[PDB]
Structure formats: C-alpha cells, structure tokens
Design a protein around this ligand. Structure first.
Ligand SMILES: O=c1ccn([C@@H]2O[C@H](COP(=O)(O)OP(=O)(O)O[C@H]3O[C@H](CO)[C@@H](O)[C@H](O)[C@H]3O)[C@@H](O)[C@H]2O)c(=O)[nH]1
Ligand SMILES: [Ca+2]
Ligand SMILES: [Ca+2]
Length: 455
C-alpha cells in the first residue's frame, strides 16, 4: 500500500468558532478530515483567516493569520497593490515551507502530494515551492489543483474587460508562470462541476484535457446522520431569528407578529410540518422561489413551518426578508441565519422535506447532507443535482422562470407532505447518501485517481 503524506493549501477559512466558511472552505475541511481517515494517509492543511488562529494543541493544520479579510477573486485581488499582493503571497509561501519542513522532519519522509485550492495563487505558490526543491536535487512532488470556479470567472472577466477586472493575472499565469501550459508544474486538476471543467479547458488549452476530472465530492456522515431522539424544540427552538440591521418589526400584520430580530420561533410544536432551505443568499439559489411557494401554501392553513438557513450581506438579507414579510405576506416562514453543521443535522433530522431550487447548482452538498440525515430533497433540473436526485430520494422540478419554479416547488412540497416522503423515502435517503457520498470513500476514490492519472 502506498503511504500518502499530503500538504493541502486552501484559499478560504475553515468553519470554526467565530467564522462560517464558504462552500470551498467546507470542501477543503472535509477533504482534510477524509484523507486523514484513511489508513496510511496523513494530510496537513493551511488556510487563511483574519479571525481564527493557529491551534497550539494540535499539529494537523495551521492558519495563515492575516490582518485583513481574505482576498477574493470575484476584498478583491484586483483592489490590492502589486506590493500587497507580493507580500501576501511571499508570507504565505514562507508559512507553507515552514510547515512542510515540520512535517517532513516529524515523519522522516517527504511530502508526496501537494493539493492547491483554486486556479490562482495557491498553485503559483506550490509550483514555486517545487522549483526550489528540484533546485536542491529533490524530486518534485505531484501538484493537484481544485478548480472551484472563482479564479476561472476572474480570468474570464479579465479577458472580457469587465470593470474591476483590468487584465493582470490571466496573461501572467499563462505567459510568465506557465502554470497550466504543460504538466511541468501541475499534474492534474479536479473540477467541482462539468461547467468548471469546460471553462478551465477553454482558458488553459495546452493543459491535457484527460488530466482534468470531476472532483469526487463527499459529505460528513459523522455529523450529518439521523440524530436519535432529536426534537424540533432542541433542533431549532433556541435559534434566534436573524433578519437585517434596522429591521422594523412594527411593519408586520397580526399573523406576522412572531417575526422579530433576535427572538426564537414560538411554539414550534404547534406546526404540522417542517420545510427547510439552506444556502448562501446568492441570486442563483432562488430563495425567492421558496418564498413564493410558501406564499401559496400558507393560505391553506395546513400549518407548514418554513425555515430559511444561510448567510447573506445586509443588502441581500433585506431583499429576501422584505420580500417575505412585505411583498408575500408570509407568517410561518422564518430566517434563522447561518448555522453550524451539527445544528443543521439536528434540523434536517426533524424536517419533513428540504427545498434547494438552485439554478445550475455546481454539486449540491446541501442535498447530500440532508439526505444523509434521512430527509428527502427537492431541487431543480439543473446542475449537479441532476446526477444524484431521483424518485427514491426526492424530486427535481422543471427549469423555468423564478415564478414557474416557485409553483413547481409548491406542487412538489404538497406531494411530499401528502404522501409523507419523510416516512416512505427517509430510510432510502440515508442509505443512498452513506453508500455513495461518504467522505472517506470519496477520498479513497480521489487518491486512487491521483495515483492512476496524475502521478
Ligand atoms: O448556514 C450554513 C450554510 C452552509 N453550510 C455549509 O456550507 C455548505 C455549502 O453551502 P452553500 O450555501 O451551497 O455554499 P456554496 O458556497 O454555494 O457551495 C459551493 O461549494 C459546495 C462545495 O464544493 C458545492 O457543493 C456547491 O454546489 C457550491 O455552490 C453546506 O452544504 C454546509 O456544509 C453551513 O455549514 N451552514
Ligand atoms: Ca521519503
Ligand atoms: Ca478556480
């Protein structure tokens, strides 16, 4: 058996006390846990944060501690001075090489896999680290990149001459750094979705297409599984409503009066059924389709409680909250903000069905997590859900306008509740997620693929 000693350079913070993570940070964290699960495999990770700190009680990860928010492709990279970019990158490279030295000394073994998130500075840094090694007569270590899509969109914006994307990185990464111009620097790319594989190949046409594959994505079954004895009061009854700053609670109708900043949902046990959404408040998630669906079913006085989890900017929180309460007249729908993964597992455990009606969801971890807890799922016929949602575990509604998708979600929820998909499909959902998408199984497949294709 091959012994793996892996070093993984992440772009985003992990989810921890005091700071939620974006989906690409969740994915890195999960991959870390997964690879460390495997016999004969250690994985060591570094990632940036302005809020979280390197732990002093454990050695498996470090934090690149920075005094400003993490730079994003689309605080933008383009907004930084060339000096700031250089120092950010130089300092990160230095912290990477110090960690690598620690690992190699501790194990008496060289690292034999470099993982880098996104198609920008992380592969640049790791490629440079390899150059310095080969210059001392040490073998380069294979470098595998995770294409999440944001660096790719930034390059496309640069090429398309969008405001705020004056051309700076794409030409450099091709013509100076040559990162994806052969396999001399990068051994393989995993993309989260087919659209990202397509986009990568167009931008980097000298990279072998056969070395770009779809990332085998997994969920954390240790957290997301059916939580025995969970109740609605335990799961979400102590969760304060999260609206937006300056929300005016006087502008509510009599039946809306339970909606209030920082207050729990009263009498959760009184509702008949529980419908859940979870996702960041990006327009393509179509939270408004969920709200419009509830606008219809709340009139029918089946007491359906709808719970909106996830984070957004103040502007986007204001868009959906006002849409809920002012435009749509909702009264049994509540915003609970972002929540920890174990909190979400409790919620999914007691939910009747979850609705995630995204347009072109890249993969859809939320789906797998929810199914992992024994709960059926409703999506739209687009993106990654097309591959894994089937009749045994939920439903995908036909694509269309936000309004059409809303009506179709309404019909699908009505079906789910009428037919009791929680009861008839729930066991299926959990068995299917576990079998197909558990973290460790996926990481085993991922490393097999690395060994056969990228080494
Ligand atoms: O309140 C929240 C919301 C989300 N999550 C976690 O974050 C994940 C992703 O949530 P989402 O809102 O979909 O984030 P995105 O950043 O949009 O996710 C991207 O990244 C994921 C991981 O690669 C892919 O599965 C998605 O399809 C892709 O959109 C969830 O599954 C959870 O694990 C939480 O822990 N708490
Ligand atoms: Ca060795
Ligand atoms: Ca990318």
């Amino acid at each position: 058996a091959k012994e793996w000693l892996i070093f993984a350079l992440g772009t985003n913070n992990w989810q921890g006390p005091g700071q939620f993570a974006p989906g690409s940070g969740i994915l890195h964290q999960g991959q870390h846990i997964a690879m460390n699960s495997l016999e004969k495999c250690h994985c060591y990770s570094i990632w940036p944060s302005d809020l979280q700190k390197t732990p002093t009680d454990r050695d498996d990860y470090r934090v690149y501690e920075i005094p400003h928010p993490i730079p994003i492709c689309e605080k933008r990279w383009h907004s930084m001075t060339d000096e700031e970019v250089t120092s950010y990158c130089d300092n990160l490279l230095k912290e990477c090489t110090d960690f690598i030295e620690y690992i190699e000394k501790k194990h008496g073994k060289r690292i034999n896999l470099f993982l880098a998130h996104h198609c920008f500075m992380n592969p640049v840094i790791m490629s440079e680290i390899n150059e310095r090694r080969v210059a001392q007569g040490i073998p380069k270590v294979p470098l595998v990149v995770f294409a999440h899509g944001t660096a790719l969109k930034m390059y496309e914006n640069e090429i398309n001459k969008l405001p705020e994307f004056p051309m700076k990185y794409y030409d450099w990464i091709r013509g100076t750094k040559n990162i994806f111009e052969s396999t001399g620097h990068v051994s393989g790319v995993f993309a989260v979705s087919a659209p990202q594989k397509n986009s990568f190949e167009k931008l980097f046409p000298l990279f072998p297409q056969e070395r770009v594959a779809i990332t085998p994505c997994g969920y954390n079954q240790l957290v997301f599984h059916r939580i025995q004895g969970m109740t609605r009061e335990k799961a979400f009854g102590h969760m304060p409503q999260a609206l937006y700053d300056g929300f005016d609670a006087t502008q509510l109708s009599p039946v809306q009066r339970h909606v209030a900043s920082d207050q729990c949902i009263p009498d959760v046990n009184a509702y008949d059924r529980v419908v859940v959404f979870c996702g960041r408040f990006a327009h393509w998630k179509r939270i408004d389709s969920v709200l419009k669906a509830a606008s219809r079913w709340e009139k029918e006085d089946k007491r359906i409680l709808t719970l909106i989890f996830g984070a957004g900017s103040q502007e986007t929180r204001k868009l959906y909250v006002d849409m809920a309460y002012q435009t749509l007249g909702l009264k049994d729908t509540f915003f609970l903000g972002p929540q920890s993964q174990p909190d979400l597992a409790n919620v999914y455990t007691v939910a009747d069905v979850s609705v995630f009606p995204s347009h072109d969801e890249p993969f859809g971890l939320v789906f797998i997590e929810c199914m992992g807890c024994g709960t059926p799922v409703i999506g739209a016929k687009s993106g990654g859900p097309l591959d894994f949602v089937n009749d045994e575990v939920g439903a995908l509604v036909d694509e269309g306008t936000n309004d059409e998708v809303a009506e179709r979600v309404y019909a699908a929820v009505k079906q789910a509740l009428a037919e009791d998909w929680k009861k008839t499909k729930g066991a299926q959902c959990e068995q299917y997620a576990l079998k197909k998408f558990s973290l460790a199984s996926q990481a085993e497949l991922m490393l097999e693929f690395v060994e056969s294709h990228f080494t």
